[PDB]
């Protein structure tokens, strides 16, 4: 094929339950219904890549358990067609998962179990695992696995001359400078970028400031995701390249939007498209994603994205 | 060959997460860890019967999802040994599951998605479905599937002349008198016994009276589970049979204890043991269960229950 997309990151079973009200301590309650879906930022991103018919590997850790089974079925040969060669299962950790309680009062409460995502990685990455990233077209990371692993990968590929994108989605802790210095492109939303720099982000102006602070701390490029306001690519060798939303006829479910945006973006970039094309390819993919319910369910095939890009 | 134990009931993925406290509205907390296990009272009871080497069939409804395959894997040919011939899966409902939140404060909170357990049954059972209960040597029911399905099954066996046990475990709702009328043995714990009859159960005299009230509701035999106090078989017009606990060296995890007790009782009964032998064999099996974590994983094999019986006559 071509030099693959390599996503190193998280895979989660998302367990949604529709509840009237969170139960009281001691109390047992019933849900209207519930559905358990393959999810996690790394898996979403890898799934998106494989749907865009680009060669895509996922490097991650699962428990040897039902949720583990659920993730591989969804990403693999019977699903999105991600290469799972570098996924390892372990027997002493649960597959990561999240209990998403959708309360009837409009509210939503969440419990997260890092499980294998956080606890099943080696102290030192294997040479096998480093072999796939050193052979990668582009590497995608997030923050739902330990920074230590993110750093080891980023260093391996920096040596190799392979571009690495770090999505900031994940743990609400500061990013290690040694990680910030090894990545090519940092990719926050307005919220993340804000809590990242301690600076406000309600205007393009003050957003552009926090990005300066990011540039200052060793980050050559910031791909900011701005929800309904579109998105901007800041290169600290230029001024922000911008791209707004491709409007969606119906917006049912924004879940998966950011992951789709980032993966789509990364696929265009390894297909050697230009920055403007990259942004629009990603904007188109995300647009199609928010028109369907579910994250991995909603992700567009390449044909659908190319068809939409035809419009002016 | 031997007329099978036949269990009709629930199958759940039990999703356990360890948290310091419950979250607030909007709040995303982090659990310490988690584990998903095959459970549900029906699957537990089936698995327990299979592990005791009595031919066991499980009748239930799964979704065609991962949780579904987890159940089948645990119960089936490569697992406990339950015949699954009569398990049916549907595409329009998920396998039942339960989110169990183990708090740091000892408090537990549960969220139950009934799923296929409650929504994948026909309005009317097929003769295909009821053929197995008509050939049972004994039938066990619980209250984690629709009352209406419990009723059709129990009636089909009353016409067949085979003993039906109803575990009160599950829904905390009143029991349809039609159901009560068609079962041979009711099996509540003391908390269930109270809620059911409406009577208090703090003392044995009180319990004996709440059982008199079960007797007035159409059930000739009541098998009361009294936790660490033991158990008792009440048979209308006869002297109650009492059985204390068989002490466990280590109470690790009482999950599945009541299910083990009831299924073990059933196996001893359909094999023709005396009431006292049934109660004792059920007490021994439940004793072993509480010494291992998990429900289905802690279920003892026959030779161990019998061994614990020698050394604690
Ligand atoms: N209402 C919308 N209509 C069309 N496209 C949208 C809409 N909202 C978001 N998008 C697309 O999705 C992209 C990413 O969304 P957003 O900036 O919210 O990412 P995020 O907050 O990281 O998402 P997530 O919550 O999924 O992690 C946006 O840049 C935009 O192109
Ligand atoms: N600590 C213990 N030591 C030994 N045996 C025990 C212990 N706790 C329970 N058992 C056995 O388990 C049986 C059933 O327990 P219990 O009456 O609490 O069931 P239950 O409340 O229906 O259980 P569950 O909550 O699992 O549905 C008891 O009668 C007893 O024989
Ligand atoms: Mg957003
Ligand atoms: Mg995001
Ligand atoms: Mg009890
Ligand atoms: Mg019970
Ligand atoms: Na979506
Ligand atoms: Na146990």
UniProtKB/Swiss-Prot annotation, chain B:
Q: How is its activity regulated?
A: Activated by a monovalent cation that binds near, but not in, the active site. The most likely occupant of the site in vivo is potassium. Ion binding induces a conformational change that may alter substrate affinity. Repressed by calcium, rubidium and sodium. Substrate inhibition is observed in the presence of high ATP concentration (Ki=2.44 mM).
Binding, K(+):
253, 255, 289, 292, 294, 298
Major site of localization recorded for this protein: plastid
Give the E.C. number(s).
2.7.1.15
The record's Gene Ontology cellular component field reads:
chloroplast; chloroplast nucleoid; chloroplast stroma; nucleus; plastid nucleoid
Which catalytic residues are annotated?
Answer: 259
- Its top-level enzyme class, in one word, is transferase
Where found, per UniProt?
Plastid, Chloroplast stroma, Chloroplast nucleoid
Q: List UniProt keywords, sorted A-Z.
A: ATP-binding, Carbohydrate metabolism, Chloroplast, Kinase, Magnesium, Metal-binding, Nucleotide-binding, Plastid, Potassium, Transferase, Transit peptide
Could you tell me what the cofactor note in this record states?
A: Requires a divalent cation, most likely magnesium in vivo, as an electrophilic catalyst to aid phosphoryl group transfer. It is the chelate of the metal and the nucleotide that is the actual substrate.
Any GO BP: D-ribose catabolic process
Biochemical pathway: Carbohydrate metabolism; D-ribose degradation; D-ribose 5-phosphate from beta-D-ribopyranose: step 2/2
The coenzyme or cofactor needed here is: Mg(2+)
The residues that the entry says bind substrate are: 12-14, 40-44, 144, 259
User: One MF term in GO for this entry?
Assistant: ribokinase activity
- What does the annotation say about its assembly with partners? Homodimer.
Q: What does this protein do?
A: Catalyzes the phosphorylation of ribose at O-5 in a reaction requiring ATP and magnesium. The resulting D-ribose-5-phosphate can then be used either for sythesis of nucleotides, histidine, and tryptophan, or as a component of the pentose phosphate pathway. Can also use xylose and fructose as carbohydrate substrates with a low efficiency. Can use GTP, and, to a lower extent, CTP and UTP as alternative phosphoryl donors.
State the family named in the UniProt similarity comment for this chain.
Answer: Belongs to the carbohydrate kinase PfkB family. Ribokinase subfamily.
User: What name is this protein filed under?
Assistant: Ribokinase
Organism equals Arabidopsis thaliana
What gene does the UniProt entry assign to this protein?
Answer: RBSK
Q: What stretch of the whole protein does this chain cover?
A: 68 to 379 of 379
